[PDB]
Each structure stands twice: as C-alpha cells, then as structure tokens.
C-alpha cells in the first residue's frame, strides 16, 4: 500500500490523538488481527469538524464518517438494564444500528455488573476495521456477480420471465 489513510479529526483533539499514538495503535492492531499491513495513517485537522467526529479519507475521497465520543466509553454489550442502574447513555444512531456510551465513572460501575466497555480509541479502531471489512466483502460480491454474468446461459427475456414467476 503506497497511498496513506487520512483521518480528519477535531482540531481540539488532534494533539491528544498524536500523543496517544493513534496511528501506530491502528497499524499495529490491524496487523495483529488480520495479518495485513495498513498504509501510513495520517491525522489532519478537520475544518468545521465538530467534536466527536472523524472522517476517513482514502486517496482524498471520503470513505466514512465516525462518531466516537472521545471522553466516553462504549457499552459493547449494552442492554436496557443499564438505565435501571440510574445510567442514561449517550446514544448514537447510524442506519439500523445504535451505539451506547457512558462516562468513565459509569463505565467502571457497569464493568462490575457484567458489561464490556471499549474506550474511544479502541472503538475508533473498531470502526475503521468494520469499514475496511465491509468494503472488502462488497468487493468480493462484485466479483461473484461478474462470475454469474459469465456463467449465465439464459437470455434476458427468459431470465426475467423466470424471476417474475418466483
């Protein structure tokens, strides 16, 4: 890989993320989990970028925008019982999926009650790995479709007749 991954980050978080060595954390973890070598990961200030937002660019094209609450912890196996403990999560919603976040102090209480918590940087890594994995799956899917159009012996009218039937 010769083209770097770029993460646009909030201007107020950039120096903390550099001090936390986010780039090396990401590169190191991805290699251990997958055996694949990420290109260099560069952080850049995102103009107008609100807090808790990260934009992934590859080859200067926007790939995905993540919502990660830098000062909070993600409740990985969140259940509604959390609320019965007096803890009301920060909820982020992306499509059909909800993500539940709590304070560091709340996180420590939930860890004693069977919950698993991920800090923001670990969740940011997780978001990247999920995005990278989703894109690879779809790429393979495109290839499967090309193979089916190669193997296809039925013509279009006959093919479309069969589809409406079933």
Sequential DSSP letters for the chain: --SPEEEEE-TTTHHHHHHTTHHHHHHHHHHHHHS-----EEEEE-TTPPTTEEEEEETTEEEEEEE--TTSEEETT--THHHHTT---EEEEETTEEEEEE-HHHHHHHHTTT--EEEHHHHHHHHHHHHHHHHHHHHHHHHHHHHHHHH--S-HHHHHHHHHH-
CATH number at residue 149: 3.40.30.60
132 Cβ contact partners less than 8 Å away, ≥ 6 residues apart? 30
Range of the domain at 94: 1-166
| Cα 100-104-107 angle, rounded to 5 deg | 55
Q: In the sheet that 90-94 helps form, which strands lie side by side, from edge to edge? A: 90-94, 97-102, 73-75, 117-119
Domains held by the chain: number: 1
Q: Give the burial class of 56: count Cβ atoms within 10 A of its Cβ; 0-12 exposed, 13-18 middle, 19 or more buried.
A: buried
């Amino acid at each position: 890989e010769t083209v770097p991954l770029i993460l646009l980050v909030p201007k107020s978080r950039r120096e903390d993320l550099e001090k936390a060595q986010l780039a090396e954390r990401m590169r190191s973890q991805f290699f251990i989990d997958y055996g694949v070598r990420l290109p260099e990961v560069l952080l850049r200030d995102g103009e107008g970028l609100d807090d808790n937002s990260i934009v992934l660019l590859i080859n200067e094209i926007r790939v995905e925008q993540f919502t990660v609450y830098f000062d909070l912890m993600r409740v990985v196996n969140y259940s509604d019982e959390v609320v019965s403990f007096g803890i009301n999560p920060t909820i982020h919603q992306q499509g059909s999926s909800q993500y539940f976040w709590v304070t560091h102090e709340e996180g420590e209480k939930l860890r004693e009650m069977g919950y698993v918590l991920r800090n923001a940087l670990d969740e940011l890594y997780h978001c990247l790995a999920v995005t990278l994995a989703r894109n690879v799956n779809e790429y393979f899917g495109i290839q499967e479709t090309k193979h089916m159009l190669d193997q296809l012996e039925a013509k279009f009218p006959d093919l479309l007749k069969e589809v409406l039937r079933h």
